[PDB]
């Protein structure tokens, strides 16, 4: 709730103040003058724990708040940027974008709501990716994972596209970086997901609703298989056994979709007369068939398995 942070008028006032401070920093920098980001940092209210929901977290409920984030990062140092990431991960369940992108809390999102989710995904996740790829050590990445696991219902976060993608980024970065602390932290994360891994795949009624609003012929689930690939890759054999068991029905459902597309391709390609529209139809079927093969193989190959010629076998 917006009232748990000071209300709509207070947060909108904070955003306007943030913009004023960024415009001043940008003007000073452009004119080749000295810059002091103290006023801008203070206008963000990150160290402010006066409210049930931090004012920075509520600012992220608005497009204006989201859109200024890369520009904010141009004027901050490493520890300030890390404090922002720590705040985001600490209050991730209170983030409106998580509630909007979760099929559990928002089973029927409007087109406007879907656009907000795509915006947060494009801007915020690109910032997190760049920062962790360049300015983060083992302790700091481990710290962010612990912030996520200790302050949130991790299973609820996985019902959200943003939540799932944020976890994939942390896991993938941790995997690139001893073995020991990461094995322990991966296991704590695995505990919060165990018996609930199937819940990362949204219901069919949810997919239908999104597909109808976006004019999608197929639901894009590449991010789910990317998460499963990163979870499997950092896991021991026992973790992999559990993952495969929990998503077995989803593996077979994807194979069925790919096989239905292969049949459609065969039926349409044998037609003698082929207009530009039928060629568009065939190219669309082949693209979506190969997409399902590739997304599933991203997950399978990691465990030394492969889906080829209608069967899963050893790689």
């Amino acid at each position: 709730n917006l009232n748990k942070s000071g209300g709509k008028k207070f947060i909108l006032e904070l955003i306007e103040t943030v913009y004023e401070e960024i415009l001043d920093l940008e003007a000073n920098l452009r004119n080749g003058q000295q810059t002091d980001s103290t006023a801008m940092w203070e206008a963000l209210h990150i160290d402010d724990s006066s409210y049930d929901v931090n004012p920075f977290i509520s600012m992220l409920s608005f497009d204006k708040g989201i859109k200024i984030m890369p520009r904010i990062f141009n004027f901050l140092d490493k520890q300030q940027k890390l404090k922002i990431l720590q705040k985001i991960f600490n209050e991730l369940s209170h983030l409106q974008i998580i509630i909007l992108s979760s099929y559990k809390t928002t089973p029927k999102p409007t087109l406007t709501q879907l656009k907000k989710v795509d915006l947060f995904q494009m801007i915020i996740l690109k910032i997190i990716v760049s920062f962790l790829s360049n300015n983060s050590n083992f302790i700091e990445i481990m710290g962010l994972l612990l912030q996520l696991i200790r302050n949130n219902n991790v299973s609820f976060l996985t019902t959200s596209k943003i939540g799932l993608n944020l976890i994939t980024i942390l896991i993938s970065r941790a995997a690139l970086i001893e073995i020991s602390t990461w094995n322990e932290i991966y296991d704590k994360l695995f505990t919060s997901l165990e018996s609930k891994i199937q819940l990362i795949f949204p219901p069919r009624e949810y997919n239908d609703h999104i597909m109808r609003l976006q004019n999608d012929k197929f639901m894009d689930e590449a991010y789910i298989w990317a998460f499963l690939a990163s979870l499997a890759a950092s896991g021991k054999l026992n973790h992999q056994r559990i993952i495969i068991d929990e998503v077995r029905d989803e593996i077979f459902a994807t194979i069925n979709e790919a096989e239905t597309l292969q049949k459609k391709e065969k039926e349409l390609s044998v037609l003698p007369q082929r207009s530009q529209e039928l060629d568009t139809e065939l190219k669309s079927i082949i693209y979506n068939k190969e997409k399902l093969y590739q997304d599933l193989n991203l997950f399978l190959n990691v465990m030394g398995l492969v889906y080829r010629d209608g069967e899963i076998s050893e790689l």
Partner: peptide, 14 residues
């Protein structure tokens, strides 16, 4: 390291 052996079987078994 031999993960494909058992994993392929668990994917069918249950």
């Amino acid at each position: 390291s031999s993960s494909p052996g058992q994993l392929l079987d668990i994917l069918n078994s249950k």
